[PDB]
Structures are given as structure tokens and as C-alpha cells.
Amino acid sequence: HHMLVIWINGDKGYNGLAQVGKKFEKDTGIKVTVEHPYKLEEKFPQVAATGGPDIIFWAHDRFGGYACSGLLAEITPDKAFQDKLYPFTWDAVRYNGKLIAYPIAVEALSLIYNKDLLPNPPKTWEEIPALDGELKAKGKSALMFNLQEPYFTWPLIAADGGYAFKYENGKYDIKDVGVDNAGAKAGLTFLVDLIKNKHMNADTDYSIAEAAFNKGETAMTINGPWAWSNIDTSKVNYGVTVLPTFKGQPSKPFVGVLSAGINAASPNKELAKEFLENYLLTDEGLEAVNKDKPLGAVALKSYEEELAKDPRIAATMENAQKGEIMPNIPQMSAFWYAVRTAVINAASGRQTVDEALKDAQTNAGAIVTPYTIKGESMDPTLKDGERVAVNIVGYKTGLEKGNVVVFHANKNDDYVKRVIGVPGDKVEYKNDTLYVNGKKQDEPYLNYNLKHKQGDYITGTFQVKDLPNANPKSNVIPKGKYLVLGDNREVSKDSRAFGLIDEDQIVGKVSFRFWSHPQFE
Amino acid sequence: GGGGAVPTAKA
Ligand SMILES: OC[C@H]1O[C@H](O[C@H]2[C@H](O)[C@@H](O)[C@@H](O)O[C@@H]2CO)[C@H](O)[C@@H](O)[C@@H]1O
């Protein structure tokens, strides 16, 4: 209740932001604490309810997910205040008609280069192999940048046609994903070729690339405005310019708007608003942050009119113009995770580009929704109160035996049971022995219950032909129908009672974490 | 997203 806690990423001007906090404290007596936890954008949903920060700073893309999860307060700037920021910046922080954060600054990646090593930066990605050859001859490299985060590789991937979700007629279509089209494949292939030919290393990360550029070991890097301070300190004579083209096409970075959201569970929402509107988003407040680590093109018109005079900001905005504003939809998290996996696997050689991007295409558009389990009839596989992630099954798409499915039982109730037979399968039980298509099928998920039973058998003999919604002449499950049973077979009310369910009732599949995995792969 | 409660599924 007494103070404000603020989370901002470790690459941003958090010391500058703390100075703004000190000013607010001096004026108001209210203490401001600035933290930069590792992967804060992932930690925030974990803690948000269980009081998390009062204010969270991140690029706008993560906020729709947070808003959809109920974690953010609607902000309430008046007309006068809204008019002080560029209208397009407010667009980035509007979700389902409501403003869900304060925009701070526009961030786009640029090509950063060492003028002493490379007085004329390359116009094309295609030049970089030969350039690297020349620089290797003097113990340097052409290009190093963070290959572990897809943000940095995306500009090249999107150059010849890759995209995240198609925006059309006022809406993003999350069924239309552009991760495995021809342009995406060509870009990712080029990146993999660079690595194969030792022009880049698949292990290069943020710190490795930053250290290399700032020590004069590589001629070029790709980074955002927040990086410029450290380069100033290093004394490298650097330029900031337009990203090179690929196959004749501009690189297309995803453009972020650094934004500040207010935790829905904060008891300090009024103080948060005062801090953001009257201290941070002023010429003085932004200057303090900007002098620590540059923000980019700020949302506040009065200060941006000064910052826009800087050629480096002109480069930033030129690259932004070829790129695109990130979507803010909840599905963005899944997209980024899918593309991060594809880039890592393709770059390490675990998968071919075609395989990696095929999986990413699938994973980027797969909807995942949380559920809570109620009752004992799946015990011990699922427990009463257990939180699970449910993979939504597309309208009429790939259910298989063994899938644990959530389904609508009626207008008011969803149930969860295991798929034991799919359409076309012939199924019966003899005591506790499952026969599918004439062959005994082991059920390892029943092991504990089979070995801790009250009665003679936990499932017991039955045939599909005797159940509701079955074909009474056959044990072959009809088209569109599913046989579902609860793992806690002795107590479960399932298809043995209510019969086969319909494909139209199925919501999705419960995802499970397997307890074992390799120690390195 | 909507901001509502997490749905429940009866086991
Ligand atoms: O790499 C995926 C990642 O991209 C963006 O994160 C950026 C962030 O926007 C920048 O402000 C800066 O901190 O670099 C980050 C990349 O490491 C998205 O904003 C983020 O949600 C996404 O996971």
C-alpha cells in the first residue's frame, strides 16, 4: 500500500527510471522500487494476482495476453493527456476496445556498424558471406547478433514474405499464420547457410554479440536503440542504418511499443497513474530514462520533436516503416515460442528448415486455454483442483486413442475423460482387458488404480454395441463418435453410463508434462 | 482473451 513496485527489462534504462522514481518520492513521499527480473514477461502472470509489480513495462505485444487473463487495469487518461501522445501509439495498447497500457516509445531494430572496419555497410544480406571472408583475414567477423531470440532474426525471415498473423478487414486471422510460407523458408535458409559456412555461430546470444561489437571484433550487429549507450562508452565509431535487403526486399522488423501497464490487483492504481502521466511521460521524465538507455522514438510529441533530430532515430523509424507493428493478441506468446524453437532447431541442425517451420506453423496457431479439474474420476492422472492447459481442437480437424479430452456434456457442464476408441475402432472389455480392433491394448495410465482396487475389476466387461449412441449391431464405433472413460475406473461415470460422445462436443486435449526428458539434446 | 474466471472440467 505504501509504495510502487515497477518491473522493466534489464536492457532498458532502469537506473534512469529509478531517478524519476526518486523525484516522485521527493514530491509525494511515496517510495518507488524498480526491478528487472530475468524473463519478467513470463514471471508476471505467475505473480500478478499474488501481490507482483504495480507497474509492468514491456513491448505492447504481451499485453493482450495479460488483459485476456484479467491481469491489467483499464487505464483512464483524459482527452488532454491522450492528445499529448501520437495517436498510433494508443492504437498499440488498445485491446477489445479498451486502453490497457501507457505507450512510452517505438522500438525497431537497425543495422549497427563499425565505420572504421566497414565504412560502407552492405546494402544486401547476400553480400555478407564475402564480406565476412575479408574480415576473417584480419581476425574480425562481419556480423554478430542475438540468434537465441526470434525478435532479431524475424526481420530477415519476414523480408521475402514471412508473417505472424494476417491482419485483414480490421482483424487478425489466427488461422492464417505466415511462418512456413516460401518467404519465411528462404530467409531462415539463408540464416542457416550463414551458420553452416561459419559466418555466424548458432550459439551467439545477446551478451556475446554486444561484447563483440563493443570490443571492435565484429563489423556489424543488429540491435535496438537501448544498445547505443554501451556503444558510446566503448568509443567504437559506429553508424546506425537501414537493415540490408534480402532477395531485393527490405528486411521487415516487428515493431514494438514499449508500454507501461497497471496490475489489476494493485492497491496503488491511482498513484501508478500519477506516476506514469505526470512524472514519466513528461519531457523531464523521458529524458532521465533516455540518458540512461535510449528509448527510441518516444510517444510523447513534445520530446520526440527533439529526439527526431537525431539521425539514429531517423534510421530507427526508417526500419520501422518497412516492418510492422506487432499484434497484441493473446496468441502472440505462442507464436514467439514457436518461432524461437524453429530458429534454434534449424540453426543447430536438429531439424531442417522445412521441418522446423512446419512445426512452428502448427504450434504458432494452436490455441491453448487453461482449465481447472473438478472431482476424482481421473485420479491419479488428474487431481481435484489441478490446473491444466487445454489444446483447443479445431472445428472438424486429429483425436487419437489415449488423448485426454475436455468436452461439453451439456450447456452448463464441461467434463474430462480419456479417449479409448475413435470412429471406426472396434472396442470391448473383458474384465479389465481392453481389446481394440481385435488386439489387447495395454493401459499403463491405469497401473496405480489396477494395483489399488476395492473390487475384482475396475472397468469390467462391456461391449460398445450395448452403449447409448452406438450401433447396436456392432462394436465398431460409428462415424463422429468417441468412447471415453475416466482413469479412476471404479468411480467414474463415463461412456459406460452415458454412452458414446460426439465429435461436436469436444473442446480440446489436455497437455501433459512427461516427468523424464534428456539432460541435453 | 476476455478476462473471466478459468473454466472447470469435471473429471
Ligand atoms: O524474441 C521474442 C521477443 O521479441 C520481443 O522482445 C524484445 C523486446 O520487444 C525489446 O524491447 C527488447 O527487450 O528485446 C526483446 C527480444 O529479446 C517481444 O516484445 C517479446 O514478447 C518476444 O518474446
Author numbering:
A (entry chain A): 10 to 60, 62 to 407, 409 to 532
B (entry chain D): 189 to 199
Q: Mind quoting what the paper says about this structure?
A:
They belong to a group of serine proteases that utilize a Ser–Lys catalytic dyad, which differs from the classical Ser–His–Asp triad found in most serine proteases and in the eukaryotic endoplasmic reticulum signal peptidase complex.
As co-crystallization experiments with signal peptides consistently failed to show bound peptide, we modified the MBP fusion construct to allow covalent attachment of peptide substrates. This implies that the lack of density for the mature protein portion of the cleavable peptides Pep1 and Pep2 is owing to enzymatic cleavage and not to disorder of the peptide in the crystal structure. In the Pep1 and Pep2 substrate complexes, the P1 methyl group makes intimate contacts with the side chains of Ile32, Met37 and Val76 in the S1 pocket, with main-chain atoms from Lys33, Gly34, Ser36 and Met37 also at a van der Waals distance. In this post-cleavage state the C-terminal carboxyl group of P1 is hydrogen-bonded to the SpsB general base (Lys77) and receives a probable C—H⋯O hydrogen bond from Cβ of the nucleophilic Ser36 (C⋯O distance 2.8 Å, Cα—Cβ⋯O angle 104°). The Ser36 hydroxyl points away from the cleaved peptide, which is the result of a clash with the C-terminus of the cleaved peptide. In the Pep2 and Pep3 structures, the P5 proline directs the peptide chain away from the enzyme, with no residues prior to P5 making contact with the enzyme.
